[PDB]
Amino acid sequence: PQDLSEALKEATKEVHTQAENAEFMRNFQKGQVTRDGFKLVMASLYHIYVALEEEIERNKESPVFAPVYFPEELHRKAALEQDLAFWYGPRWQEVIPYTPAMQRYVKRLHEVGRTEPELLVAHAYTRYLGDLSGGQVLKKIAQKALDLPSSGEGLAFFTFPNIASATKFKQLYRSRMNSLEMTPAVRQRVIEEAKTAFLLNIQLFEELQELLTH
């Protein structure tokens, strides 16, 4: 399609399904998530978003990323810090896992931000528009599965408080994505990088399910 936002959506349909089909996500969707499994995905997300948000800050004034720079609206590191303090306690930094599959994803995010920053939009699309677009169904599942106390914390990640309307915001973000100027080669690489981002998530899911089933 002409618009990058539509090109991305169409090009990643089949890997999104692969993610939906991954065993860990099948189980999450059938509501068979455990607190230990949930904790692991929240730890994963912290590492991913620390790396992604570091590289967005690095490249925020670059013409290859500035049009989609929305820090107040989208930043997730602080929310995940709040959440991990709940799930892993006050010493969470010293005890959260940082696994090889998590490292693989973080490594690629830094390579992209430092040496192929034109591709960073692919990673911000995959994470932010996915977490925003899917956050509604994704949260629903946990709360009814995790039996959390009524302690007012642990799921801040699933609320973007500086977005009053997700629908308006997605429209805006897509608009901005579409205003990026790129050659056909870069556009091709951006699309492939969005597929790569999905596969990095899928391989993570495969690792976490392994870790949880000993």
Residues that bind ligand HEM (CB under 6 A): 8-9, 16, 19-20, 25, 29, 125-126, 129-130, 133-134, 137, 198, 201
Known binding residue 9? Answer is: yes
Query: Of the two residues 93 and 133, which places its CB atom closer to ligand HEM in the complex?
Result: 133
**Residue reference for tokens 């169409």:** 10
Sequence-separated (6 or more) residues with CB below 8 Å from residue 132:
74, 160, 163, 166, 169, 170
Query: What are the structure tokens assigned to 171, written together?
Result: 């429209």
Q: Which is nearer to ligand HEM, 8 or 96 (CB)?
A: 8
State the nearest-atom distance from the C-beta of 197 to ligand HEM, in Å: 6
Query: Least Å distance between CB 202 and ligand HEM?
Result: 7
CB 154 to ligand HEM: min, Å: 20
- Alpha-carbon distance values, 86 to 144, 145, 148 (Å): 17, 17, 11
Q: Is position 173 annotated in a ligand binding site?
A: no
Q: How far is the CB of 136 from ligand HEM (least distance, A)?
A: 7
What lies within 8 Å, CB to CB, of 100 at 6+ separation is 207
Q: How far is the CB of 63 from ligand HEM (least distance, A)?
A: 22
**Residue closer to ligand HEM, measured from CB, 5 or 59:** 5
Q: List, in order, residues 6 or more apart from 80 with CB less than 8 Å away.
A: 42, 45, 46, 49, 156, 157
* 125 annotated among ligand-binding-site residues: yes
- 86 vs 173 by CB, closer to ligand HEM: 173
| Of 121, 109, 127, nearest in space to 198 by CA | 127
Given the structure tokens 């995959």, which residue do they identify? 126
Choose between 16 and 35: whose C-beta lies nearer to ligand HEM.
16
Q: Which amino acid is at 176?
A: R
Answer whether 60's CB lies under 8 Å from 74's CB.
Answer: no
Q: Taking phi first (over 0 means left), then psi (-120 to 50 degrees means alpha), and beta for anything else, what does residue 180 get?
A: beta
The residue with its CB nearest to ligand HEM is: 130
The annotation places the binding site for heme b at 9, 16, 125, 174
The annotation places the binding site at 9, 16, 125, 174
